[PDB]
Design a protein around this ligand. Structure first.
Ligand SMILES: CC(C(=O)SCCNC(=O)CCNC(=O)[C@H](O)C(C)(C)COP(=O)(O)OP(=O)(O)OC[C@H]1O[C@@H](n2cnc3c(N)ncnc32)[C@H](O)[C@@H]1OP(=O)(O)O)=[N+]([O-])[O-]
Ligand SMILES: CC(C(=O)SCCNC(=O)CCNC(=O)[C@H](O)C(C)(C)COP(=O)(O)OP(=O)(O)OC[C@H]1O[C@@H](n2cnc3c(N)ncnc32)[C@H](O)[C@@H]1OP(=O)(O)O)=[N+]([O-])[O-]
Ligand SMILES: [Cl-]
Ligand SMILES: [Cl-]
Ligand SMILES: [Co+2]
Ligand SMILES: [Co+2]
Lengths: 144, 144
């Protein structure tokens, strides 16, 4: 089941400047940062709240590490802004198989590594009314 | 203080069809629907989770009631997809005055009515790294 909004993925040209914007404007602090070379992003997660399924909701700020990447291409075309939304689940593999069986394109055969050891997949935006949609199971098991 | 992600505003051409997409695909049900003639939208709120500040997080699906509206213009230009993000607060008036004093454009002098009697304002996307950003205080006071 999809039990929370896990994060909002926000593309930006300069991670450090956008991180500082969110800190200065709203007081949001960095929960974690990393590079994901497979996905081609430098990310910062800003935790906004905890959630009733035991998880949390974040802003995921993303700067591309290369132009030939999902975020690099998207920024070139659209400029800075919201790139994707992510829903949390305790079983991404099962929920992705169920959604595949509805005819929505699931981009990975098997979930891949995302933020903080999470396992993630994506649904094609043209099958989701224009919203690039991620499904994520956190690495650490959640207590509702 | 901004204490949660309150909702993700998602523009769509046909509210009923997009509502059914989210129900069929994810099991998300409609929490509330309404028309906001000032804003020029037909909305459906789909509750995804409760939040640690006592509030909740929703998907806010929005179909324009007229082409000459924020969502009508945005859909014409961009097609269906994420239109804005919203942060919850117990005091939108105070948080909007604090953000105004940082030089971020606050679109309303005074918060206006939004979903379920909430009071809302917006920050200009060109001051927020391309993200149209809403601040909202729910009508019913929250218990953290
Ligand atoms: C690490 C992590 C992350 O979130 S890493 C996030 C970065 N990684 C990803 O986004 C991976 C998933 N995304 C992708 O694989 C690709 O970007 C997509 C879904 C396949 C699109 O790649 P394509 O090669 O088709 O790009 P392409 O520009 O050709 O686009 C194909 C169609 O998708 C539309 N599109 C592309 N990106 C889109 C987006 N983010 N949202 C909406 N529509 C999008 C695009 O406008 C075009 O529509 P049009 O044809 O009507 O113009 N994490 O843990 O949470
Ligand atoms: C009821 C409710 C709701 O959420 S009702 C949601 C619908 N209402 C709103 O969005 C009201 C706030 N928005 C607005 O007032 C306007 O849409 C904006 C911020 C002033 C933009 O209106 P403008 O008249 O300037 O539109 P305009 O197309 O001229 O756009 C001015 C610049 O803003 C960019 N822009 C416009 N809409 C944008 C959006 N949603 N996100 C990012 N950028 C945006 C646009 O691309 C252009 O950039 P460019 O110049 O680089 O091309 N609720 O309770 O939660
Ligand atoms: Cl890596
Ligand atoms: Cl009304
Ligand atoms: Co993500
Ligand atoms: Co809204």
């Amino acid at each position: 089941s999809l039990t929370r909004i896990d994060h909002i993925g926000i593309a930006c040209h300069d991670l450090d400047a956008t991180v500082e914007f969110y800190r200065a404007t709203y007081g949001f602090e960095v929960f974690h940062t990393e590079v994901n070379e497979e996905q081609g992003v430098r990310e910062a997660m800003l935790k906004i709240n905890d959630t009733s399924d035991g998880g949390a909701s974040y802003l995921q700020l993303l700067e591309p590490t290369r132009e030939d990447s999902a975020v690099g291409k998207w920024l070139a075309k659209n400029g800075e802004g919201v790139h994707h939304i992510a829903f949390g689940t305790a079983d991404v593999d099962a929920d992705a198989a169920d959604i595949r069986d509805k005819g929505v394109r699931v981009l990975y055969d098997e979930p891949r590594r995302g933020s903080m050891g999470s396992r993630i997949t994506f649904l094609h935006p043209k099958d989701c009314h224009g919203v690039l949609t991620e499904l994520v199971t956190s690495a650490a098991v959640e207590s509702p």
